[PDB]
mmCIF file of C-alpha atoms and ligand atoms in Angstrom:
data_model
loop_
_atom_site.group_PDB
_atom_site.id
_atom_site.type_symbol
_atom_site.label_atom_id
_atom_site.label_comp_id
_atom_site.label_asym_id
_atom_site.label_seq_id
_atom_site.Cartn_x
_atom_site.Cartn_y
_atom_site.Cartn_z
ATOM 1 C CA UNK I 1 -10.610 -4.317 -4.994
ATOM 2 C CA UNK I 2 -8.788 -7.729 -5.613
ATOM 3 C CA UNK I 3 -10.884 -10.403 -4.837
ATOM 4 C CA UNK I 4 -9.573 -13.878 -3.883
ATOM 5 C CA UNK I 5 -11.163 -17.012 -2.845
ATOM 6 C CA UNK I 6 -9.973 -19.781 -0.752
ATOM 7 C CA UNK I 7 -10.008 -23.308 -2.115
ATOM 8 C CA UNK I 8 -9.110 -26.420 -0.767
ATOM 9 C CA UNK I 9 -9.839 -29.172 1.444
ATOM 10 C CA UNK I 10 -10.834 -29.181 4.781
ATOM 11 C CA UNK I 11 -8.241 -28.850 7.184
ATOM 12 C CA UNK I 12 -5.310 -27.643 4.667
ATOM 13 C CA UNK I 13 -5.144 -24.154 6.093
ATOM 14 C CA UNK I 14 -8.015 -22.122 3.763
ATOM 15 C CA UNK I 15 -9.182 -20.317 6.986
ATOM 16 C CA UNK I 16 -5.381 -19.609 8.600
ATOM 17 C CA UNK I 17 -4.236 -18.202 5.543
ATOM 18 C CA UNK I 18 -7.339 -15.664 5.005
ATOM 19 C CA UNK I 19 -6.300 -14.537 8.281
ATOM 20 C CA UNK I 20 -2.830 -14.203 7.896
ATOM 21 C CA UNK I 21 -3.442 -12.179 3.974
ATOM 22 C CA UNK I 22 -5.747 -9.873 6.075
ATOM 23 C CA UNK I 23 -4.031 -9.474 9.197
ATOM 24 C CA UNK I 24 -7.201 -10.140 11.192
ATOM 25 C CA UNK I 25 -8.474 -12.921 12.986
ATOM 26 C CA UNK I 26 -11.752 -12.904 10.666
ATOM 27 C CA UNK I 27 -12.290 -16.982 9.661
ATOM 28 C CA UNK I 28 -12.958 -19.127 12.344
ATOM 29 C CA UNK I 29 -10.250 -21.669 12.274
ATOM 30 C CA UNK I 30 -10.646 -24.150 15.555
ATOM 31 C CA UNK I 31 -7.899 -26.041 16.886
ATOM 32 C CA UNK I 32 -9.443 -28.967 18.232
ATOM 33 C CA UNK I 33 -13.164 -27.959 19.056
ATOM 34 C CA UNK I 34 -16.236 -28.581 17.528
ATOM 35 C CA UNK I 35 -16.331 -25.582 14.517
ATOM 36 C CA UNK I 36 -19.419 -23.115 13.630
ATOM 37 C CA UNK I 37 -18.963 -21.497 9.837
ATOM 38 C CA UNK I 38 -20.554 -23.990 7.556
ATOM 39 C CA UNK I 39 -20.900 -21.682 4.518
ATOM 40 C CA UNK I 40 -18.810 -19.361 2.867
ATOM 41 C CA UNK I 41 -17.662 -16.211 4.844
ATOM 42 C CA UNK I 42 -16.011 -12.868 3.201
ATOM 43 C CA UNK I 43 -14.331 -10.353 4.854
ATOM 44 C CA UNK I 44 -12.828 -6.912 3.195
ATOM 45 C CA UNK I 45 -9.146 -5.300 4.478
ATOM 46 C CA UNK I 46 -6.078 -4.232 3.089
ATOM 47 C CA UNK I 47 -3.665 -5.824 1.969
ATOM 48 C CA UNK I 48 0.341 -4.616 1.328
ATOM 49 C CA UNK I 49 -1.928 -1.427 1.181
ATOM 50 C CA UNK I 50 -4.244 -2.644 -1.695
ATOM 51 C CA UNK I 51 -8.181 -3.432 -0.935
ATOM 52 C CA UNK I 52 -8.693 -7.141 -1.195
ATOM 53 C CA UNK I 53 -11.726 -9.061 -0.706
ATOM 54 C CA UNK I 54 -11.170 -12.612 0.691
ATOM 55 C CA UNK I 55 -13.760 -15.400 0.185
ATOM 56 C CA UNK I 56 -13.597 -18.172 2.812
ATOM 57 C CA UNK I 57 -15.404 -21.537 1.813
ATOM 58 C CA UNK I 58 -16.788 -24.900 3.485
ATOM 59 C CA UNK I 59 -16.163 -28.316 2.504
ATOM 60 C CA UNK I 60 -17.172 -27.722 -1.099
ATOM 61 C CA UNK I 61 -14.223 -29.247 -2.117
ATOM 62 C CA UNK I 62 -14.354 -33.094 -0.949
ATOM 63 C CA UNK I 63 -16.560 -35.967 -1.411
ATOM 64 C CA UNK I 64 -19.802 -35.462 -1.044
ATOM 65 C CA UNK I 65 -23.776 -35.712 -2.251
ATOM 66 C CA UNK I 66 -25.406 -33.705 -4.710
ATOM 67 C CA UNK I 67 -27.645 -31.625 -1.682
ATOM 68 C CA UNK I 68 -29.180 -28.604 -1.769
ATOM 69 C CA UNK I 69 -25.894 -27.715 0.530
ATOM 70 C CA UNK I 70 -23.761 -27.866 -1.693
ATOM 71 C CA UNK I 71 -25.197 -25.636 -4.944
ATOM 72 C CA UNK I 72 -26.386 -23.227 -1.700
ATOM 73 C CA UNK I 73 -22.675 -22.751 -0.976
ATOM 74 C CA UNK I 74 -21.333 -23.100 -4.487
ATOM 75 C CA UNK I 75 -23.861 -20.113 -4.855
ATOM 76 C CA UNK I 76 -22.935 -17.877 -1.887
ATOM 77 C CA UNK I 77 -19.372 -18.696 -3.279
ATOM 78 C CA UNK I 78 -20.469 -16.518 -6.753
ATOM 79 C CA UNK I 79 -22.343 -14.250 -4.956
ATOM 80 C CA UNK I 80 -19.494 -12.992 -2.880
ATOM 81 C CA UNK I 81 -16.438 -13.368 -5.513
ATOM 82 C CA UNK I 82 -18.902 -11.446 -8.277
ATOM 83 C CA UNK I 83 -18.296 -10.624 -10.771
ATOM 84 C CA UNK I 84 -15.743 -13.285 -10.210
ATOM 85 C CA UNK I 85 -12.265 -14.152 -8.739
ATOM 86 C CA UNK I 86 -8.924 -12.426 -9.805
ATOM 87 C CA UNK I 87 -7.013 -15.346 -7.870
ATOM 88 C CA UNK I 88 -7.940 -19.069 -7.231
ATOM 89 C CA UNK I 89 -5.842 -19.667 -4.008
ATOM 90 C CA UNK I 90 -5.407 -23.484 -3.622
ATOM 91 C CA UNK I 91 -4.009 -24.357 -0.508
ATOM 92 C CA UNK I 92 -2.320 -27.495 0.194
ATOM 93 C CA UNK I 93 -0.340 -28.336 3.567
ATOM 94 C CA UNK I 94 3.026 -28.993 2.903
ATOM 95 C CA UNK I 95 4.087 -32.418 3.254
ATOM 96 C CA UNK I 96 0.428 -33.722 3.474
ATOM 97 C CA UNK I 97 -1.025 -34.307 -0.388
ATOM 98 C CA UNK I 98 -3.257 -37.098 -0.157
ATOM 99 C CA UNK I 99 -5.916 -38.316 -2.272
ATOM 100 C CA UNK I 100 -8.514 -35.963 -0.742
ATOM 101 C CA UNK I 101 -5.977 -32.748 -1.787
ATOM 102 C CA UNK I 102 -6.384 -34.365 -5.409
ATOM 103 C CA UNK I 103 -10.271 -35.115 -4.605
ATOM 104 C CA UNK I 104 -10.148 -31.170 -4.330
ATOM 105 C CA UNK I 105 -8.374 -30.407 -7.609
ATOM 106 C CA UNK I 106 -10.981 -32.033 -9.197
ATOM 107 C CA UNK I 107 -13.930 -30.027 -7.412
ATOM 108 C CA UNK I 108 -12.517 -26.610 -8.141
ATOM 109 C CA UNK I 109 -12.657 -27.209 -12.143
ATOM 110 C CA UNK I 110 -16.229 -28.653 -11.558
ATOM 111 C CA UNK I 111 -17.189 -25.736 -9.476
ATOM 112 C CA UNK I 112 -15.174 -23.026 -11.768
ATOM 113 C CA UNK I 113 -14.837 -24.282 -15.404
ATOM 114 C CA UNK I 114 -12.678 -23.884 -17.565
ATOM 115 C CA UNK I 115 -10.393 -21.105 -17.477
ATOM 116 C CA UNK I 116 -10.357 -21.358 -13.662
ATOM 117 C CA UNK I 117 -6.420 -22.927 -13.696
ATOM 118 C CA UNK I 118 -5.178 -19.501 -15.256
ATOM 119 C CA UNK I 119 -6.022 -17.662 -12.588
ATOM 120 C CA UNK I 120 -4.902 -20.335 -9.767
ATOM 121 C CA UNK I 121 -1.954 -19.806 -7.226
ATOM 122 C CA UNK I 122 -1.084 -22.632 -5.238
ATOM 123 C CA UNK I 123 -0.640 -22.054 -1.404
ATOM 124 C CA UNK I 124 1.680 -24.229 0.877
ATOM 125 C CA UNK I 125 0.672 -24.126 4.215
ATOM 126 C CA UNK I 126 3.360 -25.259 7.084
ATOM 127 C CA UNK I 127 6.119 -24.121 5.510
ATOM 128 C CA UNK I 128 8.010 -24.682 9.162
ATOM 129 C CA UNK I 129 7.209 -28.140 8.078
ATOM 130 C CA UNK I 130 9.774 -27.430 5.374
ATOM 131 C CA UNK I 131 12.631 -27.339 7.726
ATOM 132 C CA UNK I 132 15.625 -25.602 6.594
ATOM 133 C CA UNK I 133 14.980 -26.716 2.959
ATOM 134 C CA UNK I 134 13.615 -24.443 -0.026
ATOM 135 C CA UNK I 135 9.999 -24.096 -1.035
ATOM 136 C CA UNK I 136 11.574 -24.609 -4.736
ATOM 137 C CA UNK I 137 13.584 -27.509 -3.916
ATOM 138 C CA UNK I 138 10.897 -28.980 -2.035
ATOM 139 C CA UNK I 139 8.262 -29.267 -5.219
ATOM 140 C CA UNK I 140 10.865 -29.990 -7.586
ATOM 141 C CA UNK I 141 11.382 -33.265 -5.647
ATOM 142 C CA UNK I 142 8.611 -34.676 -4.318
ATOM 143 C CA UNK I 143 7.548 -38.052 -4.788
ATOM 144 C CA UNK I 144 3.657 -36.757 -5.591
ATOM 145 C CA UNK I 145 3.328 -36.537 -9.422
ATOM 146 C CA UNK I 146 -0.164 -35.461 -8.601
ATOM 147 C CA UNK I 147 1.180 -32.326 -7.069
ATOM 148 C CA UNK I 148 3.455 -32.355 -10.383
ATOM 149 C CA UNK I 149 1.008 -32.027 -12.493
ATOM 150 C CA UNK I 150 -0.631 -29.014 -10.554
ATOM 151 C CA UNK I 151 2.309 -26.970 -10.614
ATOM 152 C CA UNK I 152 2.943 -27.030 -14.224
ATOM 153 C CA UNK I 153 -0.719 -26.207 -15.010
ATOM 154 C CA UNK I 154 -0.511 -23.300 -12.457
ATOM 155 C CA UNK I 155 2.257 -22.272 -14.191
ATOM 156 C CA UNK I 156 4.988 -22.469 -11.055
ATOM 157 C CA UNK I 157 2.738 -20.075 -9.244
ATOM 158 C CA UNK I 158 2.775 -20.514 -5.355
ATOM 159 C CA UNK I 159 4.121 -19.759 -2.373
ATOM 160 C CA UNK I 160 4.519 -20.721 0.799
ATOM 161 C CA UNK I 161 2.940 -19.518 4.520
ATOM 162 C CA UNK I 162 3.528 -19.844 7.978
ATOM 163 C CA UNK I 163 0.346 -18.685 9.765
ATOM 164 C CA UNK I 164 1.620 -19.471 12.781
ATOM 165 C CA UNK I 165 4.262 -16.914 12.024
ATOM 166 C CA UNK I 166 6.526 -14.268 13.579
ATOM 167 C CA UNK I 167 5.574 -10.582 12.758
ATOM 168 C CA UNK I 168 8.724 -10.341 10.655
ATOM 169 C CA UNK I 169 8.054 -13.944 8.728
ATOM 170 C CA UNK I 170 4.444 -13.011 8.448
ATOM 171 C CA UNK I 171 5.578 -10.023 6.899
ATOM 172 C CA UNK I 172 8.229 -12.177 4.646
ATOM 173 C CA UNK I 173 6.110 -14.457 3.054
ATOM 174 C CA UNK I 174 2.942 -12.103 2.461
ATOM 175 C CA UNK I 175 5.210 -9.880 -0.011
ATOM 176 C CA UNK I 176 6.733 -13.103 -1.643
ATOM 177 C CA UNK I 177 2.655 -13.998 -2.185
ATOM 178 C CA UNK I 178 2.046 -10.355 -3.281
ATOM 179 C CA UNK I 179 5.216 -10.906 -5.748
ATOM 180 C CA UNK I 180 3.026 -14.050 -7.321
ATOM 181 C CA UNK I 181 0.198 -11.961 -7.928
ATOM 182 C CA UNK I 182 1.971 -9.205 -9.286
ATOM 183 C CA UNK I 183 3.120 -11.584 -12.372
ATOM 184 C CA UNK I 184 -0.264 -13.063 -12.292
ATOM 185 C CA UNK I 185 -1.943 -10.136 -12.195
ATOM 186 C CA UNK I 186 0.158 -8.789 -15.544
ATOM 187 C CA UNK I 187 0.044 -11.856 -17.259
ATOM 188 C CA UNK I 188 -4.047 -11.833 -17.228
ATOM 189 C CA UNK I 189 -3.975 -7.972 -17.726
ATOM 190 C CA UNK I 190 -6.412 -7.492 -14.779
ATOM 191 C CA UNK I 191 -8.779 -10.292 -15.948
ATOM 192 C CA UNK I 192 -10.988 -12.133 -13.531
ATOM 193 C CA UNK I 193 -12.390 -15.362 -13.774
ATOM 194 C CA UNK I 194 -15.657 -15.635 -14.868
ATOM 195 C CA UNK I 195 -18.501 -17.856 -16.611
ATOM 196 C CA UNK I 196 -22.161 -16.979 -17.224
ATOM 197 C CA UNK I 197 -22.827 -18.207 -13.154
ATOM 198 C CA UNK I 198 -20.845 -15.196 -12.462
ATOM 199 C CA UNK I 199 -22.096 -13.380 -14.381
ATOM 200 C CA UNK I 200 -26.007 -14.080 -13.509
ATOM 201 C CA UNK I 201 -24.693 -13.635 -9.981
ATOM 202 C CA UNK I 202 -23.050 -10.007 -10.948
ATOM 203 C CA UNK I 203 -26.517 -8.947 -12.453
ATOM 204 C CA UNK I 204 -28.391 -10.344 -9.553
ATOM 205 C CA UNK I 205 -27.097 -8.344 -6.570
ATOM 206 C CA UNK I 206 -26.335 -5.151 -8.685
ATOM 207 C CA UNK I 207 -28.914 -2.430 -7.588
ATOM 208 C CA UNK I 208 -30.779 -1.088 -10.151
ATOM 209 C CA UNK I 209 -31.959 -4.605 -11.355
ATOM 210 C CA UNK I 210 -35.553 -4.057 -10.302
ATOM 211 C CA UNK I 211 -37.483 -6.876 -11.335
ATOM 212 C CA UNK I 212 -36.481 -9.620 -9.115
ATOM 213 C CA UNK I 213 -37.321 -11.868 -11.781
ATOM 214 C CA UNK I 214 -34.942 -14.737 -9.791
ATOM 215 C CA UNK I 215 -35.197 -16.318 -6.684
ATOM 216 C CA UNK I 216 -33.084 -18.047 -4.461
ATOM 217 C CA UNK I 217 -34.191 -21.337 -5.183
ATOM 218 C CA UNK I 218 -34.148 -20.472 -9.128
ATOM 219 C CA UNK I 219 -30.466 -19.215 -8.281
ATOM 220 C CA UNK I 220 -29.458 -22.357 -6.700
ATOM 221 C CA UNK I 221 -31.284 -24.291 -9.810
ATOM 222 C CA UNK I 222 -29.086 -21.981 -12.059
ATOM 223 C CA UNK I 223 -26.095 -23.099 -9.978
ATOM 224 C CA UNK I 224 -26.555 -27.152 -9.788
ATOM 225 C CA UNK I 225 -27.429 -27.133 -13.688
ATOM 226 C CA UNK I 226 -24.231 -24.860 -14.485
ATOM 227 C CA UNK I 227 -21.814 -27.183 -12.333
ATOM 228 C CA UNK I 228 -23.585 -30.290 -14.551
ATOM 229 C CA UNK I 229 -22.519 -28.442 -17.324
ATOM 230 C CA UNK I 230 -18.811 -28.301 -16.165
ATOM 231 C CA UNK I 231 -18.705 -31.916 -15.637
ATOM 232 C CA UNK I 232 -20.179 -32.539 -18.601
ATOM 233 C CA UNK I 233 -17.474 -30.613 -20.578
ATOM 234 C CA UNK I 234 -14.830 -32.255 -18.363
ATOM 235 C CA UNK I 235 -16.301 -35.515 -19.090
ATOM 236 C CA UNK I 236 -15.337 -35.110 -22.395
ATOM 237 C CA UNK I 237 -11.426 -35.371 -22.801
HETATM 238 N N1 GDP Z 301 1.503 -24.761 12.263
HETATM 239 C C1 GDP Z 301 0.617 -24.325 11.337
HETATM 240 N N2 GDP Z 301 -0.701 -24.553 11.549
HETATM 241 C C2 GDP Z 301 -1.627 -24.139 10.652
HETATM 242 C C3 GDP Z 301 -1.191 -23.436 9.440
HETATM 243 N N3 GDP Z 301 -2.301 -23.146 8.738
HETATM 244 C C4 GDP Z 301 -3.359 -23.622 9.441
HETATM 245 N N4 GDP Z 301 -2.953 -24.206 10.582
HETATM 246 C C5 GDP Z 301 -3.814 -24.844 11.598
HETATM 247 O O1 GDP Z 301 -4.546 -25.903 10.991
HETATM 248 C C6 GDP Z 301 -5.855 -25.975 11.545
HETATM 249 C C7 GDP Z 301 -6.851 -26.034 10.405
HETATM 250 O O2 GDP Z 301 -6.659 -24.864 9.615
HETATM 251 P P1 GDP Z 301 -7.905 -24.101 8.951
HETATM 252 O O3 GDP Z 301 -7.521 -22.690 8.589
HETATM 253 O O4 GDP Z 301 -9.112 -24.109 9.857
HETATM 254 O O5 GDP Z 301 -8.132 -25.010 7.644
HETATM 255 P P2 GDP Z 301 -9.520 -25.032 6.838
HETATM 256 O O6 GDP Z 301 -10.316 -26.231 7.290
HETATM 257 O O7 GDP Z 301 -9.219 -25.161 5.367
HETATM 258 O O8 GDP Z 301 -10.304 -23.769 7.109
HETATM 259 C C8 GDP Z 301 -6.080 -24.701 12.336
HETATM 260 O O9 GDP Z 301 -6.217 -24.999 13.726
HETATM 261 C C9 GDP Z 301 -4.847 -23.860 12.116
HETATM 262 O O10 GDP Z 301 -4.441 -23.275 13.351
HETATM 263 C C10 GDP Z 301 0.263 -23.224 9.280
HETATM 264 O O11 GDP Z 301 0.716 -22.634 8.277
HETATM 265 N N5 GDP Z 301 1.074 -23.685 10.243
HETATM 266 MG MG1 MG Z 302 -12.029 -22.962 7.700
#
């Protein structure tokens, strides 16, 4: 089953486009109102007719305080995707990349490691925002060398969604996703992303363990002292 996690900021569209991939309305995603999901929600369907497994996430993405909130979600965010995530989907809203979208950039390689960008596809939210103008005109010309920068270490993967879509242009854009995947998919052979969080995750919910040795506190330890160890290595450039 392909298993994809939603990344981003808050507000960029993380919980619309879960929805729209799985055809269900499965991730809260509010209008206006006061929300509910503070911590990382997944949800199973289908998917162009292939099993998926989508991974919905909170605000881990933004500035914020080293909490016991934080590596608690970072950790339900392993513990879901496990053994880890074939896809990274980082959604930005078109025609709003602000410092906070870059904020996020930065979080996802602290939360992930390295190795995460391989397996990254970039998600455009709004594309009605677009108007009449291509998705590949669009990021060839933007004035956001930020965004630049993302797309050539993503490798020009990404796509574009309207969630608020038609059934035809829902329909459109989730094969022109599925056609991103595809070459992703070949070009890492199958490979997910992983690190040894993922993998002490993997080990931890797989029955037939028998010792509970760990604990969720010890988990969370093992969580806040990995992401430390991914800012340590991306201190060092
Ligand atoms: N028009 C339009 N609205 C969207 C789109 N994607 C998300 N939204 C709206 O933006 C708001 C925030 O989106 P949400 O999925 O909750 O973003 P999240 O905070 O990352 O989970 C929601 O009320 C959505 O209805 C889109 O592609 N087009
Ligand atoms: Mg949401």
């Amino acid at each position: 089953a392909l298993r994809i996690i939603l990344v981003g900021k808050t507000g960029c569209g993380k919980s619309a486009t879960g929805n729209s991939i799985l055809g269900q309305p499965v991730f809260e995603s509010k209008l206006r109102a006061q929300s509910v999901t503070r911590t990382c929600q997944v949800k199973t369907g289908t998917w162009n007719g292939r099993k998926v497994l989508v991974v919905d996430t909170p605000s881990i993405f933004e500035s914020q305080a080293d909490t016991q909130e934080l590596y608690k979600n970072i950790g339900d965010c392993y513990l879901l995707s496990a053994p880890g995530p074939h896809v990274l989907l980082l959604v930005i809203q078109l025609g709003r990349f602000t410092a906070q979208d870059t904020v996020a950039i930065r979080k996802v390689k602290e939360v992930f490691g390295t190795g995460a960008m391989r397996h990254v596809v970039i998600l455009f939210t709004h594309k009605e925002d677009l108007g009449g103008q291509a998705l590949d005109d669009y990021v060839a010309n933007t004035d956001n060398c930020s965004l630049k920068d993302l797309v050539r270490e993503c490798e020009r993967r990404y796509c574009a969604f309207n969630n608020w879509g038609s059934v035809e242009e829902q329909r459109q854009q989730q094969a022109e996703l599925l056609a991103v995947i595809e070459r992703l998919g070949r070009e890492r052979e199958g490979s997910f992303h992983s690190n040894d969080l993922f993998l002490d995750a993997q080990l931890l919910q797989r029955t037939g363990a028998g010792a509970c040795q760990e604990d969720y506190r010890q988990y969370q330890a093992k969580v806040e002292w990995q992401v430390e160890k991914h800012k340590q290595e991306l201190r060092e450039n």
